[PDB]
């Protein structure tokens, strides 16, 4: 039957990569990786298209949104007729329309955002619990959301549950693709996360800033480049490393990638986990470990509390006490 043939044809295409080109390639590990996509926008759609072509069978979209009239040209699982409908479940249905064997699921779930008042403590407690369970259930988490503050809670929960996070983010003509570090019990080495590179706790960036539509005002090329690199980073990362290097059968496994369209460039970068980071600092980890949701609810409503806990307040006070000479 047609579906069996589809299944065998995609399977053969993949097998040939191993048989004919890279005998050491592990295809099974990729096929069986359960993927959670946080965000079903331009990134979530393009990332999912790259994953299914690599043979990934289980993809779960999390998005609380609906399809807008401007979306289909940029968000590649939606059509004009879809406008107004809930995104996440449509994205899942769209994947199955491409390849009906997909275990594709969609969940209309809001991620609690740091810096925003809790509107309904109980309902958001449930959102938190649901998010933690989805994270725990899956193997690789793509962080593909659309603000600074939306990246905080998922970064923390993924670190807590010891899952690999691939975080991708866009600007008008540039992009960032990185893998977050994880905690190693014996090794004192750990790679940076998205929040390790500045010195402010994430907070409400949205209630204030006008022009809603600017978050999708980007050169169309950036979403496609970022999405494709994020997936290829995942496939390489899933391979075993060669003995004396940071490379696999698929090549490099960079910590961090930043690309720019204006000069057609790509930089490979690496940063260590920062002791005062408001997401991955050991003090923040410790606070979560002690109180769980009772700590998180405090941080959600009081971002400055994170700066106290992680030590950011200390290093900034030190600059305040310098005196009038880091100027003219």
């Amino acid at each position: 039957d047609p579906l069996k043939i589809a299944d065998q044809s995609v399977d053969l295409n993949l097998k040939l990569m191993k048989w004919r080109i890279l005998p050491d390639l592990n295809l099974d590990i990729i096929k069986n990786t359960k993927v959670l996509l946080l965000g079903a926008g331009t990134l979530g759609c393009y990332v999912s298209r790259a994953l299914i072509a690599w043979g990934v069978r289980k993809i779960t979209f999390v998005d609380n949104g609906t399809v807008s009239y401007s979306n289909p040209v940029r968000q590649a699982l939606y059509n004009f007729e879809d406008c107004g409908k809930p995104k996440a479940e449509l994205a899942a249905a769209s994947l199955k329309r491409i390849f009906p064997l997909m275990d594709a699921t969609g969940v209309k779930l809001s991620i609690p955002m740091i810096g925003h008042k809790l509107v309904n403590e109980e309902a958001q407690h449930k959102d938190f619990d649901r998010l933690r369970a989805l994270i725990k259930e899956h193997d690789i988490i793509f962080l593909l959301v659309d603000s600074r503050e939306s990246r905080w809670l998922p970064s923390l929960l993924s670190n807590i549950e010891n899952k690999t996070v691939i975080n991708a983010a866009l600007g008008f003509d540039s992009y960032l693709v990185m893998r977050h570090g994880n905690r190693d019990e014996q090794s004192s080495k750990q790679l940076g996360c998205y929040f390790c590179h500045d010195v402010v706790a994430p907070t409400d960036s949205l209630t204030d800033r006008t022009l809603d539509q600017m978050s999708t005002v980007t050169r169309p090329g950036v979403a496609m480049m970022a999405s494709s690199l994020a997936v290829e980073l995942m496939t390489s990362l899933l391979q075993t490393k060669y003995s004396g290097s940071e490379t696999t059968v698929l090549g490099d496994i960079p910590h961090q990638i930043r690309g720019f369209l204006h000069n057609f460039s790509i930089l490979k970068l690496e940063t260590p986990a920062y002791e005062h980071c408001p997401a991955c600092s050991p003090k923040v980890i410790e606070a979560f470990t002690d109180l769980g949701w009772e700590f998180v609810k405090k941080a959600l409503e009081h971002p400055l509390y994170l700066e106290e806990i992680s030590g950011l307040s200390v290093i900034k006070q030190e600059v305040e006490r310098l005196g009038n000479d880091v100027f003219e």
Partner: protein, 113 residues
Amino acid sequence: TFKSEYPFEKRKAESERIADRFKNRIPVICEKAEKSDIPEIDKRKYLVPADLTVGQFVYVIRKRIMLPPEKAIFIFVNDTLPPTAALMSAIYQEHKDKDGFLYVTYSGENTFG
């Protein structure tokens, strides 16, 4: 640009002057990255206490351009992103320019999806 202001031979001198007229100080040029969406900063030159960390210097920049707390940036030194905990002294040692100054750019962090 600053480096495009013609003064190479003068720069090495201005960098030497600073090396003597001031102690525990890092001469730094800090400018907005091209094409990056982020407020400008006209004051680009700095004598930075060598014992400050990168993160403390980032704080100084944030205040100088009057960036609000809800927006983040990152900095590049020679197309690398230095560790936030690193001492400016160690950064200066590793990345200092031929002309004696440490060149840094700052850019708005990406957030869209």
